[PDB]
């Protein structure tokens, strides 16, 4: 029952990185009394763990211990600060230490880092770890003073070999009662024991467990080249994420953008280096972001000769909108890495650079408040979570393979499907991030971050950002949008976006399908029945109608007119019209897909008890002109029902009429542009189209279910 | 409710059904769901007979026979797990679970054909744990058991460092695991047990189409955890074979499970309602089979007679030459004289009496085989543990060596190799045989006529020593050259089997170790009784001491000696 007020955790941290703050939060969670040493001085050692180092910490500890050389009623714990998180309570630590009995416990690892020749001098150990590691130890004040008073070397001298040499002396070890934590009972090292640690969830806290010896450690030290595993462990242990408490430090430290002064300036950066679908929609959405236009500068980098007309058309709106706008064209022969480096150099060299919001053109930002939230989070680097539609692709990696490429992690699927919500720590983010300005200025003053290597620019950026010790956060609290699939893209078309019904269904639906279709499907009016058993609902918008008409007119070969046929197996038409069947233009499969997806469910709801597969054979577009051919004679159709969609406006471009039903004396006067006509066409509907006198009119027909 | 799924299980049904009939649970609070199909042998007849005999006691019995057809179309053999077989197993188990829910019975105990539930209190001890899914840990002849400890990426075995401590019972209590199969127990009164489904995979299922991984995914998505715990011993189960073996291999596997039961427990008695198809022993194609046993020792001979009968082997039994009781009057009648300049190689004691009696019995057996002129014979002891496919492997090896032809005399079958070093030469154009070396433990050996004649001509009457140290002298492999110099001819060509076939039942410093020899009086005098050596045993085992670069991988292996599935 040792008093928990006699513990004193003392660490060393020259600066205040994110690792030191994480350790501080973990310690203050369980009520410990930490004292940091050397907060402000310069690191007079060398490389942190490349070859040697760490001789300044012993000197600092020796200088500090002079004030505790006489106290016996205190227990002193020494731990590295940048790569350690605590997972236990002070009372449990005290109980385990008292159970150990020794006056000094070190942390036992399985490797002999500095010197290899001393391997055989260590006392033998059956199962547990054998060697000694200086990353953490606990003992009484007098014994620690006796150990540390003998340090007299150069400031760059190594540290571990001194402790090892001191411990290997039998007489000294027996005199001062040294010992090691053989079975990982308090200190756990994540180097050589990565397959013995499992997360053990609980009601409101998370703890690690050692399966090999059935012990629960108190401190976790990710020494060696296993800092990424410790970063992964830090999302949960000890109060990061809990099964009933959501996230931990994932909603605080929020600016909330007060002051009345205009919000912090942001240097927008948009990069286009591939032929991407739906680019003009992205450009027109750029103006709709919720941020004042007198603060957001812009840097648009276009790297394709194919995308010049779109940006050239949309340029005046951007030039008027934002405060300052700069374009880099394709004629500069600029590699993508050089362009990204130039953008970061531009903002970094500008003292007004307060943030930096890079944004790839292959990123649809459904949420219009993403920028405000990401500025408000106040982290060094934070990225939203965008995921492909109906897949597990995303813009982050759960874990890293030894080849430094993608390697699947354990909870990637949980994060992708938003079963867990918070601000996670990941080794790789891409396609959208918000880097702070001062981080670019006084923490990464180097210029070449993307280029200068054979590797891809994104992996190079993430590697150079991880090597400096900066965390890459990733927030998936809200819905931030989706990614577009640009793997394949046929550009040899007048309007290539029309063929995108198989790759990006959602964006295709938003752009081409009529905006009132969903309401009509759900049944709040709109759909009309002007005559018995004929329906009138909207299907296509103006963009699809115009684009289809222009694409068909580009074909030119308006066949049709002769009673005999060559496109038909029978070889004889009952009634000829000038038409362009979709098989000739290659749009047949996409049209069948549209019929299967959108027309089907509505015609099922309209006529209850009817099940459709939307299998059609004949579908075409006809042109009615007073010169070439007049309207049609009364007839029937060889189908269950027919779909009659118009493709232009009445009066503006033609002066004619629609359909006339003989069995009901029903006449349709003014068909709309994107609206579709539905009616059975086999038995009880003897229809006949009206003639046109002025201009030309377009109609799309499809004899579905023959 | 107890659910059984039987197919080609006629060999195993009596013993396991007798074991399951004696569960300490009231017979009016139990129901049956036997369901058999797709079988070759007459499992249906025996299952029907047992049902008809036992239908009265139990609450309600079900019966779903589907005799035709007798094989799946797109399968290579009875052990080929085609996708149709998987589908059928899914549907059958899901039907059993569904019929266990619409009947208002809590708990359901999924037992299969080959699992031998030995402890009568297994059901009560599993009920008294208060978990949804819990499965007892069943023993086996290898590291195989009925629980996993990790899934790699798509539902495949992975050895977690917490397996051997659990399986070898270095820890106890109930431990959460990601897989339990074979025998388990599902609670049907807890609310979370309403989402478990065997056949229909979850919509998010993307892994392979094995039948036991789909239930793990269903348990994981339904937020339940599967336990497995081994506070005491429960039963045994045989290791699965390859996907190209026959039914005879499976029968031999279950018979070896039956033998491995007896070595530390009373024999697994069969049921009463159905009987066992008693077998007719064969002579291995040998001439004789001798087994030297003491009349005073009666427990040892019964288990060995049962082992020989269960393996369909006769036994031309021979008694012994009681020696703890033989005095000098009859010792010196036959010229028995202790070897000049001999001692215990490990202690220094001159000689004991158990070795004298054992050597006398072996000498008499040798004399008999010489007199009657048997080409070959097999000699045994009282403490044996046969390996899997013992009979068939021995037949094949002996047929091979006889067909090839060479100067074999003393093919060893059980021995101990203390000479741990670089491996020994392998005889060409033969399989599973290696050249002999230094070895104690003459548990069993195949004597020949020529070898026996040479050994008798050596005339070992005036040289007394233990047989395990005798035999290495006569083929020029003993370390010390003084004893060899005391002898004249070493024309013996001994051999051995690299995949050893017979091991002793009890090692030194273990439970139940009683040795007729070693702990006795000296060959002379009557007041020096050496005790059983506790610290200076020196005969523990040559298995852990061989866990090094022993190699011996250049040998040619028979098509047998290959088994196991995802677990080892």
């Amino acid at each position: 029952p040792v008093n928990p007020e006699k513990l004193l955790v003392i660490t060393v941290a020259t600066a205040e990185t994110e690792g030191y703050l994480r350790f501080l939060r973990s310690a203050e969670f369980f009520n410990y009394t930490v004292r940091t040493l050397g907060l402000g001085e310069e690191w007079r050692g060398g490389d942190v763990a490349r070859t040697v180092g760490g001789g300044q910490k012993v000197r600092w500890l020796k200088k500090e211990m002079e004030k505790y050389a006489d106290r016996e009623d205190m227990i002193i714990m020494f731990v590295d600060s940048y790569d350690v998180i605590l997972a236990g309570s002070p009372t449990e630590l005290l109980k385990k230490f008292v159970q150990s009995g020794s006056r000094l416990l070190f942390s036992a690892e399985s490797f002999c880092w500095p010197e290899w020749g001393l391997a055989e001098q260590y006392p033998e150990v059956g199962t547990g770890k054998r060697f000694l590691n200086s990353g953490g130890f606990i003992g009484f004040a007098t014994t620690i003073h006796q150990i540390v008073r003998q340090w007299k070397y150069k400031d760059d001298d190594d540290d571990q070999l001194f402790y090892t040499r001191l411990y290997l002396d039998p007489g000294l070890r027996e005199k001062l009662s040294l010992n090691l934590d053989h079975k990982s009972r308090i200190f756990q090292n994540l180097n050589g024991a990565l397959d013995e640690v499992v997360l053990k969830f609980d009601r409101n806290r998370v703890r690690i467990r050692n399966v090999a010896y059935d012990t629960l450690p108190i401190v976790v030290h990710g020494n060696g080249p296993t800092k990424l595993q410790l970063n992964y462990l830090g999302n949960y242990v000890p109060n990061g994420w809990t099964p009933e408490g959501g996230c931990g430090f994932c909603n605080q430290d929020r600016r909330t953008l007060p002051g009345g002064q205009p919000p912090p300036r942001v240097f927008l950066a948009v990069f286009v280096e591939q032929p991407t679908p739906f680019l003009p929609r992205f450009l027109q959405r750029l103006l709709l972001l919720d941020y004042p236009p007198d603060r957001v500068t812009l840097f648009l980098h276009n790297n394709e000769v194919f995308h010049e007309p779109h940006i050239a058309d949309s340029w005046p709106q951007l030039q008027d909108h934002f405060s300052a706008v700069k374009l880099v064209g394709p004629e500069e022969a600029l590699s993508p890495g050089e362009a990204r480096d130039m953008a970061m150099d531009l903002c970094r060299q500008d003292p007004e650079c307060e943030f930096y919001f890079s944004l790839d053109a292959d990123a649809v930002l459904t949420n219009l408040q993403t920028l405000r939230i990401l500025i408000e989070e106040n982290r060094k680097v934070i990225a939203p979570m965008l995921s492909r539609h109906g897949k597990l692709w995303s813009n982050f990696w759960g874990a890293l393979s030894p080849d430094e490429y993608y390697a699947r992690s354990e909870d990637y699927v949980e994060l992708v499907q938003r079963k867990r919500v918070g601000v996670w720590n990941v080794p790789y983010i891409s396609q959208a991030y918000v880097i702070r300005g001062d981080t670019l200025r006084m923490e990464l003053p180097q210029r070449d971050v993307f280029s200068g290597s054979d590797t891809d620019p994104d992996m190079a950026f993430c590697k150079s950002f991880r090597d400096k010790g900066i965390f890459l956060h990733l927030s998936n609290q809200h819905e931030f949008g989706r990614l577009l699939a640009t793997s394949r893209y046929d550009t040899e078309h007048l309007h290539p976006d029309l063929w995108q019904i198989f790759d990006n269904p959602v964006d295709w639906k938003e752009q081409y399908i009529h905006e009132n279709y969903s309401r009509a499907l759900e049944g709040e009016g709109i759909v009309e029945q002007p005559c018995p058993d004929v329906y009138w609902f909207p299907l296509l918008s103006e963009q699809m109608c115009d684009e289809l008409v222009a694409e068909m007119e580009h074909y030119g070969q308006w066949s049709g007119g002769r009673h005999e046929d060559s496109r038909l197996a029978g070889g004889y038409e009952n009634v000829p019209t000038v038409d362009i069947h979709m098989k000739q233009v290659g749009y047949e499969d996409q049209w069948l897909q549209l019929l299967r997806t959108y027309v089907g469910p509505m015609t099922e709801s309209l006529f209850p008890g009817y099940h459709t597969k939307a299998r059609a054979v004949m579908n075409f577009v006809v042109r009615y002109r007073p010169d070439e051919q007049p309207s049609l004679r009364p007839h029937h159709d060889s189908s269950t029902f027919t779909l009659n969609v118009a493709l232009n406006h009445k009066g503006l471009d033609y002066e004619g009429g629609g359909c006339r039903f003989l069995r009901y004396d029903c006449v349709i006067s003014s068909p709309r542009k994107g609206w579709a006509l539905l009616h059975p066409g086999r038995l009880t509907h003897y229809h006949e189209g009206l003639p046109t006198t002025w201009g030309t009119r377009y109609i799309m027909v499809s004899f579905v279910d023959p | 409710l107890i659910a059984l799924l039987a197919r080609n299980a006629a060999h195993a049904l009596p013993t396991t059904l007798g074991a399951l009939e004696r569960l300490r649970h009231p017979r009016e609070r139990t129901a049956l769901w036997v369901a058999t199909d797709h079988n070759m042998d007459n499992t249906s007849t025996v299952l029907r007979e047992w049902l008809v005999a036992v239908k009265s006691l139990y609450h309600s019995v079900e019966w779903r026979p589907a005799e035709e057809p007798r094989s799946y179309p797109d399968e290579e053999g009875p052990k080929h797990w085609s996708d149709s077989r998987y589908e059928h197993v899914m549907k059958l188990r899901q039907a059993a679970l569904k019929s266990a829910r619409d009947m208002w019975a809590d708990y359901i105990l999924f037992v299969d054909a080959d699992n031998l539930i030995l402890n009568p209190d297994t059901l009560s001890l599993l009920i008294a744990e208060n978990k949804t899914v819990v499965a007892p840990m069943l023993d086996s002849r290898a590291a195989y058991s009925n629980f996993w400890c990790g899934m790699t990426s798509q539902g495949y075995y992975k050895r977690t460092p917490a397996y051997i401590p659990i399986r070898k019972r270095d820890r106890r209590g109930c431990f959460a695991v990601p897989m339990v199969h074979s025998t388990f127990l599902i609670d049907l009164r807890k609310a979370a047990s309403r989402n478990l489904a065997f056949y229909p995979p979850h919509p998010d299922y993307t892994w392979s189409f094995d039948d036991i991984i789909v239930f793990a995914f269903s348990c994981k998505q339904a937020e339940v955890q599967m336990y497995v715990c081994n506070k005491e011993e429960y039963g045994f189960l045989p290791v699965p074979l390859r996907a190209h073996s026959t039914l005879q291999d499976e029968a031999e596997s279950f018979m070896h499970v039956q033998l491995e039961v007896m070595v530390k427990h009373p024999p697994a008695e069969p049921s009463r309602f159905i009987s066992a198809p008693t077998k007719t022993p064969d002579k291995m194609g040998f001439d004789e089979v001798f087994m030297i046993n003491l009349r005073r020792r009666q427990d040892r001979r019964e288990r060995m007679l049962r082992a020989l009968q269960a393996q369909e082997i006769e036994c031309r039994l021979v008694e012994a030459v009681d020696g703890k009781a033989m005095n000098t009057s009859q010792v010196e009648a036959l010229g028995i004289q202790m070897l000049p300049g001999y001692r215990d190689p490990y202690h220094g004691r001159p000689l004991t009496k158990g070795e004298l009696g054992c050597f006398l019995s072996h000498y008499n057996i040798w004399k008999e085989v010489v007199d009657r002129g048997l080409q070959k014979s097999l000699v045994f002891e009282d403490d044996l543990r046969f390996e899997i496919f013992f009979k068939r492997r021995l037949m094949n090896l002996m047929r091979d060596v006889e067909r090839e032809g060479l100067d074999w005399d003393l093919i060893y079958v059980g021995r101990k190799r203390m000479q741990v070093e670089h491996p020994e030469k392998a005889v060409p154009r033969v399989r599973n045989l290696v050249e002999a070396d230094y070895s104690y433990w003459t548990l069993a050996y195949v004597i020949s006529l020529q070898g026996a004649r040479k050994l008798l001509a050596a005339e070992p009457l005036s040289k007394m020593l233990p047989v395990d140290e005798f035999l290495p002298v006569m083929f020029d492999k003993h370390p010390v050259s003084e004893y060899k110099a005391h002898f004249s001819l070493r024309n013996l060509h001994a051999f051995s089997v690299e995949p050893l076939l017979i091991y002793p039942t009890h090692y030194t410093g273990d439970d139940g170790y009683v040795s007729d020899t070693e702990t006795s009086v000296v060959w002379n005098n009557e007041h020096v009784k050496t005790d059983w050596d506790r610290a200076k045993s020196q005969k523990m085992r040559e298995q852990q001491a061989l866990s090094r670069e022993a190699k011996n991988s250049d040998v040619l292996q028979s098509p047998l000696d290959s088994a196991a599935r995802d677990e080892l």
Binding site: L194, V197, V198, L199, K200, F201, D202, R203, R209, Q229, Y232, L233, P243, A399, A407, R408, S409, E410 | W104, N130, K131, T132, G150, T152, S153, T160, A176, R189, K190, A191, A192, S193, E223, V224, Q225
Partner: peptide, 19 residues
């Protein structure tokens, strides 16, 4: 793949008795 887990699955509530 790293850090295998042992999720919090608390024993489920019993079902209402049959009648």
């Amino acid at each position: 793949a790293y850090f295998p887990e042992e999720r919090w699955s608390p024993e489920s509530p019993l079902q209402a008795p049959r009648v």
